[PDB]
Amino acid sequence: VSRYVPDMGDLIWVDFDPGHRPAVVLSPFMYNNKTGMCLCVPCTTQSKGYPFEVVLSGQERDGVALADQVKSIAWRARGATKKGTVAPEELQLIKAKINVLIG
Amino acid sequence: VSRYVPDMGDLIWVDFHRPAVVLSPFMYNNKTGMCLCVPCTTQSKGYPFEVVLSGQERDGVALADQVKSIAWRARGATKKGTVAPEELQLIKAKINVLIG
Amino acid sequence: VSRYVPDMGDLIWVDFDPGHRPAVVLSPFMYNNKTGMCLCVPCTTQSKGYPFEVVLSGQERDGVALADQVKSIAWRARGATKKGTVAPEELQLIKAKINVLIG
Amino acid sequence: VSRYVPDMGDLIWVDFHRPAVVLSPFMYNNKTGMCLCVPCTTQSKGYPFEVVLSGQERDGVALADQVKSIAWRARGATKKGTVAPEELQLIKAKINVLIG
Amino acid sequence: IHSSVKRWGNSPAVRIPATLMQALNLNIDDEVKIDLVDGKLIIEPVRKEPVFTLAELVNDITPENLHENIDWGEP
Amino acid sequence: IHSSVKRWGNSPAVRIPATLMQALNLNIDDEVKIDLVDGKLIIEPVRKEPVFTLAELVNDITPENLHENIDWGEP
């Protein structure tokens, strides 16, 4: 059976009943694959210029990652789908902003 | 009115038993009404991300990989203890290896 | 307009009226792209154990490249299609056998 | 019967005007009835793969990148001249840069 | 260790086993530097990254740009 | 020169501009060696390749295994 396992930097659609939230994956494949969990930050088209926002370019829709809302999600149980990947520079900005809070 | 505002290192119970260790700085927690934390559990199982919290009768192990942001101001939070900076550093170091 | 331009090592179908011959590309992208020509060797399912044959593995069909039949083809004028790529080791064997004849 | 068998470096005319310089060794040409060659043309145009063939009245430039295998024995071939090893090396070196 | 250069989309690229990537502290989506010397293509991690302070980010938070906590829902 | 490590199919891989690949004499489908030292992933071309002689190949040609010239047709 072929199944998607997320990589660091992947932009995924996380499901929930109904129904999905876009998110950027922060943890590596090995951890994600072994545990069925992954750390990520949610995305939203509702940009407000909040300082923890990181603009994501060249995606289907214009949007931003909310770096301060780091979340451990059960991607395997919920059933995630890959939508794309963020640029290395965008992932560095997300990680640099998270570092201010829990580094 | 006097109100409790979570500080980094505080062990809190959040309303909705959900014990957690606050990881983010007071300055951020106070301005946003939000905080980043990791859940606590009472039994150690040898999971690599467990960090033992000494001098903690109840829920003495933090699950470092399970970070979450919570709306503590909206939901309500109560302080139940304080975790030593040394232990908080172990939690943060594990998180850094994972994502950083 | 999007058009296929062959790379060294690509396995292509070369057209002819009607109608196509499978071939392994030997020349680089830059030359292929600039000239509309490419050097290649033909493939055949008719293996006979001839010494200039190079076995191509993991392809749709079992077959061999005839290394001694190097041919300059007008791939752009004819209208070539990509079918896959040969393994680095297989391309080295083709090139090593050609070298015996025109090296 | 005496028959012409192309040697490496021979300038030949193949039946079917198709002048070409034979690149493959006599031993191979003789055993297979085939040979690898490059076509000749009479006018130099500054194309990078052109190699000038000295002491060649007709078709004095070889187009090094346009290698082809031909069935000389089946089709028939006639010797029209010989190209110096030095010039044959220039042709082969250009081919090597391209594919080798 | 033997690998290869192949065409990935419009660009040449080289495959590396996950165990090696992991052994070198690199991750998928990491930026790298490729400075070439002598005859060996060189590839290394980047050391410089954007740096922010707690003060600069928190001071820019306002009641108007603050976001509510995302509702992740349930499976 | 800045590049990145990304996931190409099941494997991590790094993109290199064509001009650099060309500047280093490498081509698409070339084998390479990646020997790691200190802190810089190393990648270099292979020097050893299969070697045949004219005699060994031509001597193995027989009337039975000989192939006719391919008919490439016309456009």
Side-chain angles (χ1 to χ4, degrees):
Chain A
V1 184
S2 292
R3 292 278 169 270
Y4 166 63
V5 180
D7 266 314
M8 166 82 70
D10 282 358
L11 180 67
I12 64 176
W13 269 3
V14 175
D15 306 326
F16 67 76
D17 209 309
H20 60 51
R21 283 255 52 169
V24 175
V25 180
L26 299 172
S27 47
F29 172 79
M30 187 174 69
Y31 168 88
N32 302 339
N33 193 34
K34 179 173 180 188
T35 67
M37 311 298 282
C38 69
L39 281 168
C40 64
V41 287
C43 295
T44 181
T45 57
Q46 284 180 42
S47 44
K48 305 179 174 188
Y50 178 68
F52 288 88
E53 283 172 19
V54 173
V55 172
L56 306 182
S57 299
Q59 289 305 323
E60 58 175 60
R61 35 158 256 188
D62 257 39
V64 298
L66 301 181
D68 61 335
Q69 290 195 45
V70 174
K71 169 70 166 179
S72 167
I73 60 168
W75 69 268
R76 181 172 280 139
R78 290 172 175 262
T81 304
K82 187 174 179 186
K83 303 307 293 184
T85 64
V86 303
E89 290 261 297
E90 297 168 339
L91 192 60
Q92 281 178 179
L93 288 164
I94 291 170
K95 291 176 185 173
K97 291 189 173 180
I98 291 167
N99 189 256
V100 158
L101 298 181
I102 60 174
Chain B
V1 192
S2 296
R3 302 287 289 205
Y4 166 59
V5 180
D7 194 358
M8 178 185 303
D10 285 358
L11 175 66
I12 65 180
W13 278 9
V14 180
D15 296 325
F16 49 63
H17 190 182
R18 282 186 159 179
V21 179
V22 178
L23 303 189
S24 51
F26 170 83
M27 197 178 88
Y28 168 85
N29 307 337
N30 198 25
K31 196 161 189 191
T32 61
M34 305 157 66
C35 65
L36 281 168
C37 57
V38 287
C40 293
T41 186
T42 45
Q43 47 169 176
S44 181
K45 293 171 181 161
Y47 185 61
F49 289 87
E50 297 177 349
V51 172
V52 176
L53 310 179
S54 61
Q56 232 55 263
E57 253 84 304
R58 308 181 179 179
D59 312 298
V61 346
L63 298 176
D65 59 327
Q66 294 159 53
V67 180
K68 62 192 169 181
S69 171
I70 65 171
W72 71 267
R73 178 168 283 141
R75 292 170 61 185
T78 297
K79 185 172 179 183
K80 306 304 295 192
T82 65
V83 173
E86 176 263 335
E87 295 172 345
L88 212 65
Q89 190 289 321
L90 294 170
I91 293 165
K92 292 184 175 172
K94 286 181 181 292
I95 293 166
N96 188 81
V97 168
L98 196 53
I99 58 182
Chain C
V1 184
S2 292
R3 292 278 169 270
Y4 166 63
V5 180
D7 266 314
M8 166 82 70
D10 282 358
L11 180 67
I12 64 176
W13 269 3
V14 175
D15 306 326
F16 67 76
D17 209 309
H20 60 51
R21 283 255 52 169
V24 175
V25 180
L26 299 172
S27 47
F29 172 79
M30 187 174 69
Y31 168 88
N32 302 339
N33 193 34
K34 179 173 180 188
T35 67
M37 311 298 282
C38 69
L39 281 168
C40 64
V41 287
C43 295
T44 181
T45 57
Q46 284 180 42
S47 44
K48 305 179 174 188
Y50 178 68
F52 288 88
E53 283 172 19
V54 173
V55 172
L56 306 182
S57 299
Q59 289 305 323
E60 58 175 60
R61 35 158 256 188
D62 257 39
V64 298
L66 301 181
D68 61 335
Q69 290 195 45
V70 174
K71 169 70 166 179
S72 167
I73 60 168
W75 69 268
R76 181 172 280 139
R78 290 172 175 262
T81 304
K82 187 174 179 186
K83 303 307 293 184
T85 64
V86 303
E89 290 261 297
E90 297 168 339
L91 192 60
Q92 281 178 179
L93 288 164
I94 291 170
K95 291 176 185 173
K97 291 189 173 180
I98 291 167
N99 189 256
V100 158
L101 298 181
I102 60 174
Chain D
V1 192
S2 296
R3 302 287 289 205
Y4 166 59
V5 180
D7 194 358
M8 178 185 303
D10 285 358
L11 175 66
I12 65 180
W13 278 9
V14 180
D15 296 325
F16 49 63
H17 190 182
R18 282 186 159 179
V21 179
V22 178
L23 303 189
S24 51
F26 170 83
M27 197 178 88
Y28 168 85
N29 307 337
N30 198 25
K31 196 161 189 191
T32 61
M34 305 157 66
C35 65
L36 281 168
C37 57
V38 287
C40 293
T41 186
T42 45
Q43 47 169 176
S44 181
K45 293 171 181 161
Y47 185 61
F49 289 87
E50 297 177 349
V51 172
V52 176
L53 310 179
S54 61
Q56 232 55 263
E57 253 84 304
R58 308 181 179 179
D59 312 298
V61 346
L63 298 176
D65 59 327
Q66 294 159 53
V67 180
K68 62 192 169 181
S69 171
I70 65 171
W72 71 267
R73 178 168 283 141
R75 292 170 61 185
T78 297
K79 185 172 179 183
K80 306 304 295 192
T82 65
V83 173
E86 176 263 335
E87 295 172 345
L88 212 65
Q89 190 289 321
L90 294 170
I91 293 165
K92 292 184 175 172
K94 286 181 181 292
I95 293 166
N96 188 81
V97 168
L98 196 53
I99 58 182
Chain E
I1 316 174
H2 285 233
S3 189
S4 64
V5 175
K6 292 179 174 186
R7 180 79 65 183
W8 180 15
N10 245 285
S11 189
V14 170
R15 288 185 190 58
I16 296 301
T19 58
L20 173 57
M21 171 189 79
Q22 291 163 170
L24 217 38
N25 301 112
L26 293 173
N27 274 291
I28 296 302
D29 221 7
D30 270 356
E31 287 175 30
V32 293
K33 291 175 178 173
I34 304 180
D35 313 306
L36 177 64
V37 182
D38 70 298
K40 294 182 182 174
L41 177 62
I42 309 292
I43 298 178
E44 61 178 305
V46 173
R47 165 65 66 194
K48 292 181 179 175
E49 306 172 319
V51 169
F52 300 92
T53 62
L54 178 63
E56 79 179 301
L57 301 182
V58 175
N59 291 343
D60 280 331
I61 292 180
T62 68
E64 300 81 21
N65 66 25
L66 183 70
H67 289 266
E68 321 172 314
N69 270 264
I70 293 299
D71 181 358
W72 292 90
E74 292 290 55
Chain F
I1 316 174
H2 285 233
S3 189
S4 64
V5 175
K6 292 179 174 186
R7 180 79 65 183
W8 180 15
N10 245 285
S11 189
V14 170
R15 288 185 190 58
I16 296 301
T19 58
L20 173 57
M21 171 189 79
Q22 291 163 170
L24 217 38
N25 301 112
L26 293 173
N27 274 291
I28 296 302
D29 221 7
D30 270 356
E31 287 175 30
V32 293
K33 291 175 178 173
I34 304 180
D35 313 306
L36 177 64
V37 182
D38 70 298
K40 294 182 182 174
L41 177 62
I42 309 292
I43 298 178
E44 61 178 305
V46 173
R47 165 65 66 194
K48 292 181 179 175
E49 306 172 319
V51 169
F52 300 92
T53 62
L54 178 63
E56 79 179 301
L57 301 182
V58 175
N59 291 343
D60 280 331
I61 292 180
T62 68
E64 300 81 21
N65 66 25
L66 183 70
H67 289 266
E68 321 172 314
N69 270 264
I70 293 299
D71 181 358
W72 292 90
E74 292 290 55

